[model samples]
Target: SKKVMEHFMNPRNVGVIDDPDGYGKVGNPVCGALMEIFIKVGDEKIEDIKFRTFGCGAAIATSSMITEMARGKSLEEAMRITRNDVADALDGLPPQKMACSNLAADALHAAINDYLSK
Candidate 1:
């Protein structure tokens, strides 16, 4: 999809946040890469989010999409974001990529969980 490629071409929020209030990292041995999510929370909402992905275009694109979806959303809302929600937002992902590449939401939810836990 164009959207996917657009995000892949120009991935958004692609870095780390200093002293991030929440953080999560996950790797896919099957796909051979890792993704990290850093978040800053305030007023019970995700005030900022950034992702770092060392992998394929799909991995980067999903990272970008999840950041876009999560920014400014409440922690609960962001926690609810799923791999399926990410692929759907991208218009859809290939079956193979669906398993590993769409783990952005996993990382994001993990970050939210980290925030809540601390």
Candidate 2:
């Protein structure tokens, strides 16, 4: 997967959330893959986005790229982003690493939804 490799080599928004409008943390303790997403929403748009991921290179890459894609995008736009988009953002992803993309996109949407519900 070209995409997976690209993201792993050069992840997008890799960092912390600090003070965020919405935050979501998800992970499988057994697997040791934890993802925490923070988002700032304004007028239905994602004003800013950040994330912290604890896992393998794939996890870090997915978190970073997904956050980058969500930033400046409307909530709807962010929600519309699928695992495929995240995978595609990196050009492509290996089948085994596809789950990483899904996790990243899901975490982002969960954060956005949390913000909207609040």
Candidate 3:
């Protein structure tokens, strides 16, 4: 809950990019939470990344952490970031909110895939 609050208190990369090179969206029906990731790629690396989330505290923090984890990373490296990675970065969320972490990673992967599709 420590890192979670810190991230929630100061969420990063919270916005949409105009004409993003890659875009991803994911939602948890149960929680009615939505997450979106937007990325700009340059030289096979994530030149920039941003996210917008409408959900609980955990969702916001995870989205913030995922963007920080992916920024400036090669697409491959960013793809390697898993759900657990996001959770662990925040010192682990509660079991119920763990799904929030998955959304963050999934959204990131979806964005990366979107970039590859181009």
Candidate 4:
């Protein structure tokens, strides 16, 4: 699938920020899908980003794509990113795995919020 391939191939933001302004980690114990994200916000923009994931192919792909999209964006721009955007970045995911994309976007937003709050 293009989604799976994109994720595995061009996995976005696959590392960690040296000093992130905010960080967040979440997991679905039942599904064994986990994700961690870090962001560096500067001048109200997301200047840098990174992430780690432990999950299925879709999960990893989505996490990677989200990290790529979030970087070099303003906080508002980052927050504006949606599941559809991540899915689009992957060229589209299977309907069953659509939620994984949503999870990725949500987690990223949460991490950015955490940074802003601090």
Candidate 5:
């Protein structure tokens, strides 16, 4: 989708930062890559967020998309951030990407998933 590729072209929040004391991660389904998410919480809200992804344009877009959704928002907001949500914010993940390419979430999940799946 033009929206996704277009969204990932210029990178933002390309570095991951996962909050240790807050709503963190969880992912699935395909050629998922590697990803990380970190957040700086403040005023009972997300002061900031960062994400890094080693995957397809889909990953880059989602990595960028997910952070914005949670950054500068209430912790409640962060919890509301769903991978499908980010995909929509990116003008909608392609049909294929949706079915399985949840790389952003999947990547993050895969990281921990792979680690624990041991």
Candidate 6:
């Protein structure tokens, strides 16, 4: 997908979140890919979102893409997002990579879950 390639070349939300309200980390040993996300939840929406990805073009692009999809929505809305949504937002992804890549949403959910636990 052109969108995926574009994001991979110029990833967004690719930096830090200082003292975040929630932080999530996820990695797959098989893919040797890892994703970290920082989120600030405010009211019912996501006030801030950021991500770091160490992995293939697929994971990087999808990680970046998920942040874009999730930034301003309610936690409910963002939680509704799936890896498949990440793939579609990227316009598409490798069939095999689809399942293994794009972990930002998962990380985001984990972050939210942690926030809830707190």
Instruction: Name the best candidate (by TM-score).
Output: 1
Q: What TM-score does model 1 achieve against the real structure?
A: 0.92
Error of 6 at 37 (Å): 0.5
User: Which structure is stronger by lDDT: 1 or 6?
Assistant: 1
Candidates 3 and 5 compared: the better one by lDDT is 3
Clashing pairs in 4: none
In model 3, the runs with Cα more than 4 Å from the true position are: 55-57
Runs of candidate 4 exceeding 4 Å displacement:
2-4, 55-57, 97-99
**lDDT of each model, Cα atoms only?**
0.86, 0.75, 0.86, 0.77, 0.57, 0.80
2-70: candidate 3 lDDT, tens digit per residue = 778878889899999999999999898776788889999999899999999876545787788889989
Predicted structure 6: lDDT: 0.80
Clashing pairs in 3: none
Clashing pairs in 2: 3-90, 3-92
Error of 6 at 15 (Å): 1.3
lDDT of 2 by residue, 59-90 (tens): 77667777888889888888998878776677
What is every candidate's alpha-carbon RMSD to the true fold? 1.4, 2.4, 1.5, 2.1, 5.6, 1.7
Residue-wise C-alpha lDDT for candidate 5, range 49-118, written one tens digit per residue: 6666544344667777666666677755555667777766876664564634454554333333333333
lDDT of 4 by residue, 47-80 (tens): 8888887765447777877787787888888899
- TM-scores, each model vs. reference: 0.92, 0.82, 0.91, 0.83, 0.66, 0.89
Summarize candidate 1's per-residue lDDT along 31-64 as a digit string, tens digits: 7788899999999999999999776545888889
Error of 1 at 74 (Å): 0.4
Q: Which ten residues in a row have the lowest lDDT in candidate 6?
A: 94-103
Residue 19 of model 2 has an lDDT of: 80
Candidate 6 deviation (Cα RMSD): 1.7
